[PDB]
């Protein structure tokens, strides 16, 4: 509590876990390489105010 009083919590009460639900992503076994792709367009559009 505001780095002042440490809270009343009994010793055993912090040995408990905190469960959570998460999403995650891993490369599956035996894949040799991963690919990533995207496209890019460029326009000469700074010459004049929209």
């Amino acid at each position: 509590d505001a780095n002042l009083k440490p809270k009343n919590i009994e010793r055993y009460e912090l040995a408990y876990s905190n469960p959570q639900t998460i999403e995650a992503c891993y490369v599956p076994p035996n894949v040799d390489e991963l690919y990533c792709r995207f496209s890019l367009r460029v326009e000469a559009n700074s010459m004049r105010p929209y």
């Binding site: 009343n8 009994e10 010793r11 055993y12 009460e13 408990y16």
Partner: protein, 195 residues
């Protein structure tokens, strides 16, 4: 009025007067349950004979109730309270006022017994006697030390806690929570003295 004894074979025949008084008080509540009839002489007169085979009788009194308790079992033993089997025989050890084992001979024999009981019942898949739960005030008595010392001993990790309490709560001294075999072993391991 004095002691003055020699060839004191019985466990009631040695010691300071305060102990000799305490031993009689204990005998009386435990075996003279009959209501006072001011048989002040006769009622107590028998206590000396009683103790003459003590080193070999006390254990049988304790053994008898292990078996009678067992056949009335309703829960697996590892959630059973120590008290449900032995009926507070431990608390009675507090009627003699001395704390150390070499003088309080009633406590000395009770511990002897419990050590042997654990020794013949090692851990396996199904729970058995020896896994019973003790409360904080009980370990204090068996370990010959005050209660606050047990809390300190827990805090340093010298012994495990078996029941998970709820949050924002506290475990009171009367709650049953340590296994018997854990207390017996710890005492042999690090609580001995010249007493």
């Amino acid at each position: 009025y004095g002691c003055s004894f020699e060839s004191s074979n019985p466990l009631l025949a040695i010691g300071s007067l305060s102990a000799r008084f305490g031993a009689l008080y204990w005998y009386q509540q435990r075996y003279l349950s009959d209501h006072e009839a001011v048989r002040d002489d006769r009622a107590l007169t028998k206590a000396i004979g009683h103790f003459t085979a003590w080193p070999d009788a006390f254990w049988r009194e304790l053994q008898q109730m292990v078996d009678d308790a067992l056949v009335r079992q309703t829960k697996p033993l590892n959630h059973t309270d120590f008290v449900d089997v032995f009926g507070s025989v431990v608390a009675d050890c507090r009627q003699i006022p001395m704390r150390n084992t070499g003088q309080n001979f009633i406590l000395k024999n009770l511990i002897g017994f419990l050590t042997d009981l654990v020794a013949r019942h090692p851990q396996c898949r199904v729970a058995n006697v020896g896994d019973l739960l003790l409360s904080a005030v009980d370990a204090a008595t068996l370990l010959s030390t005050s209660v606050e010392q047990v809390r300190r001993l827990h805090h340093e990790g010298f012994l495990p806690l078996s029941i998970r309490p709820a949050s924002r709560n506290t475990v009171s001294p009367h709650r049953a929570v340590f296994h018997l075999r854990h207390v017996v072993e710890l005492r042999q391991a690090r609580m001995q003295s010249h007493h």
